[PDB]
Design a binder for this molecule. Structure first.
Ligand code: NA
Ligand code: NA
Ligand code: NA
Ligand code: NA
Ligand code: NA
Ligand code: NA
Ligand code: NA
Ligand code: NA
Lengths: 62, 62
């Protein structure tokens, strides 16, 4: 809807892209791309664990 | 120059933004914003350590 970025956060990205020796756009894509992976695995693990508890309660209730 | 994203990486971002309950654009900014921080601190620490060694060699050489 309304994307929000701080002028002090826009600086961090310009600075970190420089450190990484990449463009601000390549840094943004790269970080979004790898943080997407982290998030996917995190959620995979939480759903898997949610599935173990429902497996235990399935047995215990019977 | 030429930004590159895999069709299989574009999917990960759409999926992870959904998990995070954010737009693909807000997810991208947010992840770039927080990964910029990680990178800044990483480099701060490497420069600080580089400064300790040059401090040791400064003494040892004299
Ligand atoms: Na800052
Ligand atoms: Na500034
Ligand atoms: Na990067
Ligand atoms: Na369990
Ligand atoms: Na994938
Ligand atoms: Na696909
Ligand atoms: Na996020
Ligand atoms: Na040292």
């Amino acid at each position: 809807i309304d994307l929000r970025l701080t002028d002090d956060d826009k600086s961090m990205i310009e600075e970190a892209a420089a450190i990484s020796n990449q463009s601000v756009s390549q840094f943004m894509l790269n970080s979004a791309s790898q943080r997407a992976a982290e998030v996917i695995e995190q959620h995979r693990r939480v759903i898997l664990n949610e599935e173990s508890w429902t497996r235990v309660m399935d047995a215990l209730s019977n």
